[PDB]
C-alpha cells in the first residue's frame, strides 16, 4: 500500500489483503 | 462517507483496517 488516490475494487485491493481472513465486505456496488 | 477521503486525497493502510469490522 503506498500514498496514492484508489477507489472501486482498489478499495478493497487495499483492504482485500490488509483485513484478509478477517471479514470484510463493507460495500457491495452491485 | 468512507471513501469520502481515501478515494480524493490519500489513507494509512492501517486505517483502511477501520472498514473490516
Known sequence: FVNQHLCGSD???????????????????? | GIVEQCCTSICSLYQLENYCN
Open chain 1, 11 to 30: 478499495l478493497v485491493e487495499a483492504l482485500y489483503l490488509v483485513c484478509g481472513e478477517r471479514g470484510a465486505f463493507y460495500t457491495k456496488p452491485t
